[PDB]
Amino acid sequence: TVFRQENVDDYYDTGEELGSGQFAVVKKCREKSTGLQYAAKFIKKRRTKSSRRGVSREDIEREVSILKEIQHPNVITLHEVYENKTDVILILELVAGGELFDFLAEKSLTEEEATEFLKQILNGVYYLHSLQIAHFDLKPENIMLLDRNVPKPRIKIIDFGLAHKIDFGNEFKNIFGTPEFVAPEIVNYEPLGLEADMWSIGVITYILLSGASPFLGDTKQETLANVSAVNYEFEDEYFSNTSALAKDFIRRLLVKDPKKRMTIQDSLQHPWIKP
Ligand SMILES: COc1cc(/C=C/c2cc(O)cc(O)c2)ccc1O
DSSP states (O other): OOOBOSOGGGTEEEEEEEEEOSSEEEEEEEETTTOOEEEEEEEEBOSSTTOOSSBOHHHHHHHHHHHHHOOOTTBOOEEEEEEOSSEEEEEEEOOOSOBHHHHHHHOOOOHHHHHHHHHHHHHHHHHHHHTTEEOOOOSGGGEEESOTTSSSOOEEEOOOTTOEEOTTSOBOOOOOOOGGGOOHHHHTTOOBOTHHHHHHHHHHHHHHHHSSOSSOOSSHHHHHHHHHHTOOOOOHHHHTTSOHHHHHHHHTTSOSSGGGSOOHHHHHHSTTTOO
8 A cells, every 4th residue: 555655844844853763753743734733653664675674564554554444532543644765654643741651750640540541541442442453562651641731631542553453353473562561472472362452451550550560670581571470469568558449450450361351341341440
């Protein structure tokens, strides 16, 4: 599938850089014809078939195809796609309130504050999983706010770079997400489905309530070993005034066997969440 090959700079003006990763940089932008503001994600293309730098066209097209399907208040939406010899440029909805992570470092949240964010995350993931889309990269860095200055901001899931359609219940590919947040089946290179996202939500919830990462070791291999062994506990110093039901919610997500893990629908009916 081909994208718009006119020069993006003839239609948009770029501004402040919002972030940069291994093969992508995100810049605030403004469409000349409407004055509307977006985030332009420049993804570096692979320049030879056998190279390991840049993103393969198969991977770029998959992310674009997934973004084109989704429209939900808690998920980023795609406006336009351009390309040239060096980059594919996704013109994405502007989410300017910063990461849930950076907003986390400023505060540990109360259970009402945590559940207010978490309910929006669960709503967005319920939408995705209803479409058989696994995100595969849920972590605080990929949870951003629209306006961080209100007592209860609205969040949006971003970064569909690892997302996959799961039309056979599982997909057998390597997902190189970040160790602290990936499920045991990712660590062990096993078939992957929607369940992996639910584990990631359990990790996010643990951090939201405590400010601490449940599996984090001193090295990436330690973290991955801890994940595979389900080597975590609720430290009383961090959880002493956290409700048992909040702990129960986490405990039913941080489950090694994906079949025994709470699903997205389970998580919405769990007594900690269900109104
Ligand atoms: C903040 O740090 C980072 C943010 C982003 C992405 C920001 C962003 C992404 C979108 O898809 C839409 C948007 O409005 C903003 C990428 C790498 C980073 O390191």
